[PDB]
Structure formats: structure tokens, C-alpha cells
Amino acid sequence: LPSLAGDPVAVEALLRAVFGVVVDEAIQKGTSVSQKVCEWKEPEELKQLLDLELRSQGESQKQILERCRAVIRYSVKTGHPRFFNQLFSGLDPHALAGRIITESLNTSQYTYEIAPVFVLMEEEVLRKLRALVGWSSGDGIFCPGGSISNMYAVNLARYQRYPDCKQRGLRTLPPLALFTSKECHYSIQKGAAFLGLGTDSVRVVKADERGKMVPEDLERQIGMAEAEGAVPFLVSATSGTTVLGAFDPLEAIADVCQRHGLWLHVDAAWGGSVLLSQTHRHLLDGIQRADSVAWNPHKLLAAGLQCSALLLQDTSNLLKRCHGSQASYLFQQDKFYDVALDTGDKVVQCGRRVDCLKLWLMWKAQGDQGLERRIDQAFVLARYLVEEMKKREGFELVMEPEFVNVCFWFVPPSLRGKQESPDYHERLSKVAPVLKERMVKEGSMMIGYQPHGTRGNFFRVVVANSALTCADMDFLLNELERLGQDL
Amino acid sequence: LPSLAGDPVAVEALLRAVFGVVVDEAIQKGTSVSQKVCEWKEPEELKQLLDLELRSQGESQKQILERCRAVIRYSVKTGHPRFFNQLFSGLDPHALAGRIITESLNTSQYTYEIAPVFVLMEEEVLRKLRALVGWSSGDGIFCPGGSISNMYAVNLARYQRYPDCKQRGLRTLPPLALFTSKECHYSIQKGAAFLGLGTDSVRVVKADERGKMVPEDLERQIGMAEAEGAVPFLVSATSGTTVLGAFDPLEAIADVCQRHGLWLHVDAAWGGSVLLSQTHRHLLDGIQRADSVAWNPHKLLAAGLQCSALLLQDTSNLLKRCHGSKFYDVALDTGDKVVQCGRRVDCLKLWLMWKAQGDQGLERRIDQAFVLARYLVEEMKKREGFELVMEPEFVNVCFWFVPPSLRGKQESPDYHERLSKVAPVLKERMVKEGSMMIGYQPHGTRGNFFRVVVANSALTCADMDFLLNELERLGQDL
Ligand SMILES: *Cc1c(COP(=O)(O)O)cnc(C)c1O
Numbered sequence: 001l002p003s004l005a006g007d008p009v010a011v012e013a014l015l016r017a018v019f020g021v022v023v024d025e026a027i028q029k030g031t032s033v034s035q036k037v038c039e040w041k042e043p044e045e046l047k048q049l050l051d052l053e054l055r056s057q058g059e060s061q062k063q064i065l066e067r068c069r070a071v072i073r074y075s076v077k078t079g080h081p082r083f084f085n086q087l088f089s090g091l092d093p094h095a096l097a098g099r100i101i102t103e104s105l106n107t108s109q110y111t112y113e114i115a116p117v118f119v120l121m122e123e124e125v126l127r128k129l130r131a132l133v134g135w136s137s138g139d140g141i142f143c144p145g146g147s148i149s150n151m152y153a154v155n156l157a158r159y160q161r162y163p164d165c166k167q168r169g170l171r172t173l174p175p176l177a178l179f180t181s182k183e184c185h186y187s188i189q190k191g192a193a194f195l196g197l198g199t200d201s202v203r204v205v206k207a208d209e210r211g212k213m214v215p216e217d218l219e220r221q222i223g224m225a226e227a228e229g230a231v232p233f234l235v236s237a238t239s240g241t242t243v244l245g246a247f248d249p250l251e252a253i254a255d256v257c258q259r260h261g262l263w264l265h266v267d268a269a270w271g272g273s274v275l276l277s278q279t280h281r282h283l284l285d286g287i288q289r290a291d292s293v294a295w296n297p298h299k300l301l302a303a304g305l306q307c308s309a310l311l312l313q314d315t316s317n318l319l320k321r322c323h324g325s326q327a328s329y330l331f332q333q334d335k336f337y338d339v340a341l342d343t344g345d346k347v348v349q350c351g352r353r354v355d356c357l358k359l360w361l362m363w364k365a366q367g368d369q370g371l372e373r374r375i376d377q378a379f380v381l382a383r384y385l386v387e388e389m390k391k392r393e394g395f396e397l398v399m400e401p402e403f404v405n406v407c408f409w410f411v412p413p414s415l416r417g418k419q420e421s422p423d424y425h426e427r428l429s430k431v432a433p434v435l436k437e438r439m440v441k442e443g444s445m446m447i448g449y450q451p452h453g454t455r456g457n458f459f460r461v462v463v464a465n466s467a468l469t470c471a472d473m474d475f476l477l478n479e480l481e482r483l484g485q486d487l
Numbered sequence: 488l489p490s491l492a493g494d495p496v497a498v499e500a501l502l503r504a505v506f507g508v509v510v511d512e513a514i515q516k517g518t519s520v521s522q523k524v525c526e527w528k529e530p531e532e533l534k535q536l537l538d539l540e541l542r543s544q545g546e547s548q549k550q551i552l553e554r555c556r557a558v559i560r561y562s563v564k565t566g567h568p569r570f571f572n573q574l575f576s577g578l579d580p581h582a583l584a585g586r587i588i589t590e591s592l593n594t595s596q597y598t599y600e601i602a603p604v605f606v607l608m609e610e611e612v613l614r615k616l617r618a619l620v621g622w623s624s625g626d627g628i629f630c631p632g633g634s635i636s637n638m639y640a641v642n643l644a645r646y647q648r649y650p651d652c653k654q655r656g657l658r659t660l661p662p663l664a665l666f667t668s669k670e671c672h673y674s675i676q677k678g679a680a681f682l683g684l685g686t687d688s689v690r691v692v693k694a695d696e697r698g699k700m701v702p703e704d705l706e707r708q709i710g711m712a713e714a715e716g717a718v719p720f721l722v723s724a725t726s727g728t729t730v731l732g733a734f735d736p737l738e739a740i741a742d743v744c745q746r747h748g749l750w751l752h753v754d755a756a757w758g759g760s761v762l763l764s765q766t767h768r769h770l771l772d773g774i775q776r777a778d779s780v781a782w783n784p785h786k787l788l789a790a791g792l793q794c795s796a797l798l799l800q801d802t803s804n805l806l807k808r809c810h811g812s813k814f815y816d817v818a819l820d821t822g823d824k825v826v827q828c829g830r831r832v833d834c835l836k837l838w839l840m841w842k843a844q845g846d847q848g849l850e851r852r853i854d855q856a857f858v859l860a861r862y863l864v865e866e867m868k869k870r871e872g873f874e875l876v877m878e879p880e881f882v883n884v885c886f887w888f889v890p891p892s893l894r895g896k897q898e899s900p901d902y903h904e905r906l907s908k909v910a911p912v913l914k915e916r917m918v919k920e921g922s923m924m925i926g927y928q929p930h931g932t933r934g935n936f937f938r939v940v941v942a943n944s945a946l947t948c949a950d951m952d953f954l955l956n957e958l959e960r961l962g963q964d965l
């Protein structure tokens with residue numbers, strides 16, 4: 001019987017050819033301002049171009065390389081400087097190098113025995129993240145997304161309060177109440193439903209005109225929950241909301257939590273990266289008082305999806321106690337290394353991706369200093385965009401940004417001066433969808449839009465890509481004016 | 488203000504050099520029988536070799552490339568033909584090509600707007616997987632591991648029966664009962680605890696001498712739950728257990744489920760890939776009767792961690808209804824189907840390999856793994872000092888090595904206790920030599936035995952001979 005792994009003359013030839021296409025088309029053309037951010041195709045046309053159906057007979061190297069080219073060609077270039085659609089943008093070359101190594105090594109982040117380098121590396125990465133929060137002791141894990149990080153935090157808080165629920169379930173326990181801002185309630189609600197608490201267990205707290213949770217309303221809602229028979233157990237503050245980029249007042253919220261004996265979770269998936277900035281880290285003042293912090297380096301630090309940590313001040317092996325399986329004890333296992341290093345008991349996953357190397361390698365190249373410089377420059381470019389938009393006709397700022405989320409309407413010539421008509425906001429709301437379609441079909445830029453509060457669709461420009469220059473901000477304004485002129 | 492992304496000349500030089508190191512050290516040396524499966528280092532020594540501390544100042548390209556070399560050198564080679572430690576092994580070069588492309592395109596599998604190729608590609612992959620289960624329509628998702636797929640299945644079954652739980656929570660429901668085999672993955676219990684049901688809601692059903700759930704005991708446990716006023720709602724059958732590789736009797740289990748109106752989930756994380764084999768797919772006969780199927784192509788098909796699908800017969804958007812909070816059809820977007828928000832692209836690595844291989848190529852590999860597993864069993868029987876746990880149903884070959892000092896001593900009163908200590912010593916020896924890695928574990932009433940998983944597409948008969956010869960050599964003085 002022959003090896004079915006592949007002709008090894010073919011393997012080197014294949015990977016060399018593929019990496020050539022990746023360098024030319026994904027890494028170089030995909031980050032070049034002279035190329036398109038996206039090549040729009042209607043779903044049915046793209047199906048035709050991709051010939052997707054999986055079938056009986058295989059294909060040749062030539063056929064495979066043509067498919068690789070097509071996949072890259074028609075994919076959105078998220079590393080492109082004019083990709084502003086998400087809370088990630090850019091292609092850090094060291095993070096990419098780390099990703100490529102990780103994929104080549106294909107292991108599970110599980111035991112020192114199958115992942116010795118990564119068991120040690122993850123520990124260091126989590127220790128460093130904890131240091132930036134303000135903790136020199138604690139624990140933590142990587143999770144497959146911040147949404148799941150948030151769920152872990154809720155599960156851990158529930159377990160600390162009611163450890164028997166791990167065996168008996170929560171059905172006979174009192175009603176549990178958790179609290180979060182109106183500006184960040186989606187994964188919290190999804191998580192509450194998944195964990196068996198129900199979305200009704202989530203009490204949504206008022207946010208002020210800057211998008212910040214109101215501590216007086218938090219206190220009010222805690223009292224109302226108690227009056228309805230519930231047991232408050234957790235408050236989830238948000239340090240960097242997804243739309244406005246607002247930062248909750250952590251010191252005041254920590255005070256409320258302390259008064260009521262509640263677990264404080266900080267959802268810093270987006271804003272946590274600001275801890276690298278000496279100039280801007282004050283936005284998270286009080287975060288060291290948290291019981292848990294979610295932080296996604298795959299967002300502002302550009303580590304690559306997914307890179308999402310849950311950080312704890314805990315030193316009681318709460319993760320292992322809460323998530324661990326019951327061990328058998330009939331026969332001694334004589335493991336020849338310190339199995340305290342292993343993380344299988346800390347997670348509800350079994351197999352787990354290595355997410356630490358892409359972050360670690362980039363952090364080795366950049367240092368704290370390089371990552372700080374990038375954060376600070378993003379803040380500068382966001383403020384530059386705001387200042388420049390005020391000088392042009394048509395741009396209406398939603399609010400002054402606290403972070404790098406710049407939110408605004410584009411008012412086209414046909415609506416300029418018509419602010420006091422009865423259907424103005426209704427008409428203005430239809431503008432961003434049309435402009436988005438045009439920029440996408442042109443391939444020149446992508447900006448996200450959404451409605452929020454009592455107002456209709458406005459743009460959210462996220463200023464995150466380390467490649468950005470002032471000229472890119474100028475381009476964005478110039479292009480909106482050009483695409484919007486006939487609206 | 489300058490770009491802070493990097494000088495393009497420096498970037499190309501870095502990436503070409505990293506790729507060279509990866510090809511030389513991870514892909515070539517990491518899959519060569521002339522090289523070590525692992526280079527064992529004690530944690531303290533490895534910490535010194537890696538200089539991990541994250542610091543204020545950055546480093547040069549030369550320094551970064553040195554670190555890349557060290558990371559690869561001291562990592563375990565899971566593509567190596569003598570890596571037998573897990574339910575994945577081998578390095579498929581098309582899957583790897585797909586992985587690299589995926590990482591270079593770094594997007595979220597969330598909307599057609601930011602992932603147009605991958606939205607369409609994932610639709611095809613899920614269609615194909617459903618087709619192989621036996622469904623021409625249905626739904627499904629990729630999940631960050633089979634453990635999470637299993638949890639989704641439980642959440643979905645709960646929601647289908649008691650949709651108001653999504654808002655009102657478990658306190659407002661009757662006690663719920665779910666059922667799984669004694670041989671099942673510990674993820675069902677972890678999942679039950681996470682979902683708020685408690686591990687006590689999981690009724691563990693007896694398995695027979697072949698490691699298969701006993702349908703008569705499933706029925707008995709359902710009746711006992713009902714007698715207590717618990718509401719049965721889900722049975723989780725296992726098609727390919729992690730230790731023995733046993734396959735539950737799905738037709739008989741589906742009959743019990745049908746009689747009681749229960750959701751049938753099949754945990755085929757491991758065994759689901761056998762659906763590609765005409766010869767062996769009968770091991771999953773009845774799977775088309777399931778409501779949900781978990782299947783991990785990252786295990787037997789070698790797609791790359793993680794590649795874990797949850798497949799549903801449902802066509803009524805149960806996923807979006809259960810988990811949910813334009814110039815194209817928003818039906819293409821998948822964000823409402825998951826409790827994740829951002830989601831990795833996992834389909835391309837599988838799809839590209841499947842394009843290269845076809846069903847035919849993947850089938851040939853599955854069939855060859857069964858042939859090599861049977862070869863290993865037959866050869867082991869011919870040597871002194873191997874005791875088979877059972878005849879394998881799959882590619883999990885489980886056995887003790889009995890060293891010369893214990894041969895003939897089976898009737899001694901402390902034989903099993905002494906024998907149990909052998910696998911740990913052999914494991915330490917093979918790891919420190921760097922020649923092979925085989926997992927061991929105890930089971931039932933007896934102690935540590937080896938589980939050799941025959942999955943790597945590069946395996947030959949000579950590798951199976953090597954394994955036996957090496958255990959004999961390493962165990963001679965025990
Ligand atoms: C992104 C984000 C999340 C969810 O993170 P995922 O990794 O996409 O699951 C949760 N909360 C906030 C504030 C976020 O910015």
C-alpha cells in the first residue's frame with residue numbers, strides 16, 4: 001500500500017505556487033490603494049464563477065491554482081486601507097506569519113504534551129494582557145470569540161454564587177438578574193438564552209447622551225429586580241461600544257457592584273486594546289476592579305480572527321473547577337511532566353485552536369511601544385477625520401467620538417437646508433444605503449452603516465488599519481461627496 | 488503621518504523567509520520518518536529556549552526569523568506518520584494551502600458583504616455534508632469545535648420543545664432529561680452544565696461489551712426519567728467513540744426516539760467521515776433519521792483544526808429562530824444562526840482539499856485507514872506481548888503491551904495493576920526518544936492501554952511494523 005499523502009515532488013511545487021499567488025494577489029494587491037477593496041458580484045454570478053459543487057473526481061494542480069486565484073480575486077480585501085466596514089482592518093505581516101506557522105503546525109491548545117511551545121506561550125500572553133489591565137496575578141483563557149468570552153464570564157459568576165448548579169441546574173434556584181447597557185446588549189442576551197437564564201434575566205440599563213451607562217439607573221434597576229424576586233449577580237460594563245465606541249464609567253459602576261456584592265464583568269472586546277496607550281488608557285480607569293475582562297486583540301491590535309481573551313483576577317482555579325470534568329481514580333496515571341500547565345479543564349471546548357502565536361509574534365516585532373504608536377495614531381486619524389468633515393458641506397456628525405468610531409450622516413445636495421421638513425429624517429435615512437451600494441459596486445471603499453436610538457441610518461467609520469494615512473481620510477470624504485452629488 | 492503597517496520590501500522579505508522556514512522545517516522535516524515526531528524539552532528548559540516575555544521594545548527581522556525557527560523546531564509534529572496521539576494526524580497540502588489563503592484574507596463568516604466567496608462556499612460544503620448524511624435539504628452551521636456543536640444541538644432541541652425558554656429561562660420549564668452512552672464524549676455533560684440544565688439532567692445509558700449503547704437500557708432510563716416527572720427531550724447517540732471507536736446502533740435508537748417523540752442527535756464528530764466510504768458507511772446506518780448530526784472533518788478527513796459542522800434536517804429556520812437577536816438577499820447572511828458574532832472561515836481548507844481529491848480520493852484514504860488498522864491488529868496477534876482490548880470497529884486500535892517480566896503472570900493477583908503502569912513508562916520513553924507518540928488511557932474496570940489511531944494518509948504497512956518493533960524494543964527491559 002502506497003502513502004496517499006501526495007507525490008512529494010508535487011507538494012513543494014504546489015505550495016510554492018500557492019504562496020506565490022497569495023503574495024501577489026492577497027498580500028500585495030489586497031493592501032494596495034491602487035486596487036479595489038472588493039469586486040462585487042451578484043450571488044448567482046459568483047456561484048457560476050466559482051463552480052463550487054464537490055464531486056466524485058479530483059482535480060489537477062493547474063485547476064486548483066485557478067480556483068485559488070478566483071477565491072482571492074473575489075474575496076473582500078480586509079487588509080485594504082479603504083476597508084472601514086468592521087472593528088478589524090489591516091494585514092499585519094507578523095501576525096500573518098504567526099497565522100501561517102500555526103496552520104502548518106496544526107495542533108490543539110490542550111496539553112503540554114501536544115502543544116509544549118503554545119502552552120507556555122499562551123500563559124505569557126495572558127499574563128501580559130492581565131498586566132495591562134492592572135493585575136499582576138490571575139487567570140484566563142482564549143475563547144472562540146468575545147461573545148463566548150462573555151458567556152464564560154456569566155457562567156463563572158453563576159458558579160461562584162451557586163456552585164451546585166453545575167450538577168443540579170438553575171431551575172430550582174432563585175431568579176437571577178444581570179445588568180448591561182442599552183448600548184451593548186446583544187451577545188449578553190444571546191448568552192443568557194444559551195445559558196438557560198432566558199433573555200428576560202438581562203436588565204437593560206439606560207445610557208446617556210454620550211452612550212455611557214448611567215450608574216444611577218443601574219442602581220435603580222438592581223432595586224427593581226430585587227422587588228420582582230430576583231437575585232442580582234452580575235453587571236456587564238462595556239469599554240468601547242460597537243457603534244459609538246463609548247466607554248462606560250467603570251469606577252462608578254464598580255462602586256455599585258461593591259455595594260451589592262455583584263460580579264463585575266467588563267466587555268472590553270473592542271476598547272481593551274486601548275490599555276496599550278499611556279495617553280488613552282484612562283478611558284478604562286477602574287477596570288482593575290473588575291472580576292473579569294473580555295478583550296479581542298483581533299480587533300484593534302489586528303491579530304487575526306479569532307483572538308479573544310477572558311481575563312480574571314481569580315487565583316482559586318475557578319476556571320478548572322467550573323468547567324472541568326470529573327476525573328477517574330481507579331489507576332494511577334504517571335505523567336512525566338507538570339500537568340498543572342494543561343488547560344483542558346478550564347474550557348467547555350475540547351479541541352482548541354492555537355490563537356496566541358499570531359499575537360505573540362506581532363508583539364515581539366512591535367513591542368509595547370509599536371502597538372502603542374499604532375493606537376495613538378488611530379486616535380489622531382479619527383480626530384483628523386472629524387475636524388475635516390466639519391469643513392465640508394453635507395456631513396452631520398452624530399457626536400464627538402470618544403474612540404476611533406466616527407459616526408455621521410452624509411446630507412446630499414437635495415436635502416441640504418431641508419432640515420425642518422416633516423419627512424427629513426425619513427429621507428436622510430435612505431441615503432447611506434444607496435451610497436454603500438455605490439461604493440461597493442465601484443470597489444473604492446466600504447463603510448458600515450446602521451440606525452441607532454431614534455435616528456436612522458448613519459455611517460460608522462472605524463479608524464483601525466495601521467496603514468491609514470491622512471490621504472485616506474481625505475479620500476473617504478471626497479468619495480462620499482462624489483458618489484452623493486446626485487442624491 | 489506615515490503608514491505603520493510596514494515597508495513593503497521588508498514585508499515581502501519577511502514573509503518569503505517565514506514561508507521557507509515553514510516548508511523546510513514544518514512541512515518537509517515535520518512529515519519525514521527520518522526526523523523526530525517531537526523534540527522533548529522540560530518546561531523550564533523550553534521557557535529558556537523561547538524567551539517568551541513580551542516587552543516594551545520590538546525586535547529585528549533577524550530576531551523574528553530565529554523565533555519562527557525555534558517555535559517550529561520545538562513544536563510537536565502532528566503531520567508526522569508516527570504521530571498517533573490524537574484523532575487527527577497528517578498534513579494534507581491542499582488543506583494547508585486553503586488554511587494559508589484563509590489567514591491571508593482574514594474575514595468573518597458573517598455576511599455576504601464581507602465574505603461573498605466563503606458564504607457561498609460554506610453553503611456548498613454544508614449541502615455536501617448533508618447529502619452524505621442522506622438529506623437533500625436542511626440547515627447547518629460550522630461551530631468552534633464539536634463540543635460546541637453538541638451544545639448547539641441540545642439548545643436547539645430545548646427551543647424546539649419549549650421556545651419560551653429563550654426568553655423566560657429554565658426555571659419556568661419542567662425538569663428536562665437527556666440521554667447518552669457511558670462511552671460518550673464528556674462534552675455532553677460539560678454542555679448540560681453550561682446550558683443551565685446541570686450534569687444531573689444527563690442520564691448515562693449502559694454500553695455493551697463492544698462499547699455500543701444498549702437500546703433496552705435507553706428505554707429503561709427514559710421510563711425512569713418519566714416516572715420522576717422529568718421530561719425526556721433528547722438522545723445523543725455516538726457514531727465513533729473517542730477511545731474504542733464504537734458505533735451506536737442508530738436504527739434501534741431512532742426507533743426508541745420515535746416512540747417517545749425525542750430529538751435524536753448523533754455525535755459523529757469522529758465517525759461521520761466514514762460516510763465518504765461506500766464499504767464502511769453502513770456503520771452509520773440510520774443516521775438519516777437524526778434531527779441533528781455533529782461531524783468534524785478536522786479529524787479523519789485532515790482538514791485542519793477546527794472544522795466542525797452541525798447538520799440539521801430542519802428547513803424551518805430553527806437555527807435563526809433559536810439563536811437570532813440591502814442590495815442582496817439577506818437570507819445569505821448567517822449571523823442569526825449562531826451565538827457567536829464574529830466567526831472564522833473554516834470551509835475553504837476542507838473545500839480545496841475535497842476539490843483536489845474528490846469523493847474518490849477521500850474515500851480511498853478512509854478505506855486505506857481501515858485496511859491499515861486491521862493490518863496492525865492482525866500483526867499484533869502474531870507477536871508475544873500484545874493483548875488486544877477488542878477487535879476494532881473503526882480505526883482506533885486499543886491494546887496493552889505486556890513486557891517480558893509480566894508474560895505468563897496473568898493469574899498473579901496483582902497482574903492488572905502492574906500492567907497498567909507499563910504504558911506510562913513506554914510513553915515517556917518514546918516521547919524522549921522522539922520516535923513516536925501514542926496516547927493511553929484506562930477504561931472500565933481495567934488500567935492504562937494504548938489507543939493507536941490509524942488516520943494519517945501517509946501511513947504504510949512499514950509504519951505499522953515499525954510501531955510494533957519499537958514497542959518491543961522500548962519494553963524489553965520492563
Ligand atoms: C466584538 C464585540 C463583541 C463580540 O465579539 P466577537 O469576537 O465578534 O464574538 C462583544 N462585545 C463588544 C463590545 C464587541 O465589540
Ligand SMILES: *Cc1c(COP(=O)(O)O)cnc(C)c1O
Nearest residue numbers: 350351632633634672729756757
Ligand atoms: C472529538 C469529539 C468530540 C469533541 O470535538 P471537539 O472538536 O474536540 O470539541 C465530541 N465527541 C466525539 C465523539 C469526538 O470524537
